[PDB]
Amino acid sequence: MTEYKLVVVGAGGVGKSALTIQLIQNHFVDEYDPTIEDSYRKQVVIDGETCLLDILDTAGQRDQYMRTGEGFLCVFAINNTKSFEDIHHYREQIKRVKDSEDVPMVLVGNNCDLPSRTVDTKQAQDLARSYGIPFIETSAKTRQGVDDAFYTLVREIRKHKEKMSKDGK
Ligand SMILES: Nc1nc2c(ncn2[C@@H]2O[C@H](COP(=O)(O)OP(=O)(O)NP(=O)(O)O)[C@@H](O)[C@H]2O)c(=O)[nH]1
Ligand SMILES: [Mg+2]
């Protein structure tokens, strides 16, 4: 099969671990145990391809994981304006470490079940459109969007691989 190295990045407390554990283990972690660094491997069928997902769940509050990752799940929380503002800085850091302008990424607005919203859907859709990447709203609590976020990132990596192979021709 093909292995895909995915890295979940973003500010503290936005739900990176809860999203990843929903994908891997199908349950919601209600408690908040700040991560040092956790890794998971999951075989899944995406678009009738058997792939191995190697997923790195990073600390919220770097260069090595940015070098290794093939695609980045850039998570903010819709109730945390700073976490949304942080995305630009994560993206610039990744571009710098990769020495490249084209890096597979998906923007994820988590906590979409909460009423305390300070980041509008349009703000985030507009940002993703500028970066040329998908935007998915998710809730690790209700599982809304979880599979879509990770599978979309695999699709972006596949597209990148084709754009690079055709770029070399
Ligand atoms: N209502 C709701 N709570 C969520 C959601 N995602 C995460 N949480 C809660 O938010 C808290 C932090 O989640 P967690 O996944 O640990 O955040 P993190 O981004 O991994 N933090 P760190 O960067 O310190 O490891 C936990 O109490 C978790 O239950 C969500 O979509 N909705
Ligand atoms: Mg965590």
Helices, strands, pairings?
Elements: E1 2-9, H1 16-25, E2 37-46, E3 49-58, H2 63-68, E4 71-77, H3 81-97, E5 105-110, H4 121-131, E6 135-137, H5 146-168
Parallel strand pairs: 1-3, 1-4, 4-5, 5-6
Antiparallel strand pairs: 2-3
Bound molecules: phosphoaminophosphonic acid-guanylate ester (GNP) and magnesium ion (MG).
Magnesium ion binds near residues 16, 17, 35 and 57.
Task: Summarize, please.
With about 170 residues, this protein is α/β, with parallel strands linked by helices. The chain has helices spanning about 15-25, 65-70, 80-95, 120-130, 145-169, and strands at about 1-10, 35-45, 50-60, 70-75, 105-110, 135. It has one domain: 3-Layer(aba) Sandwich (Rossmann fold).
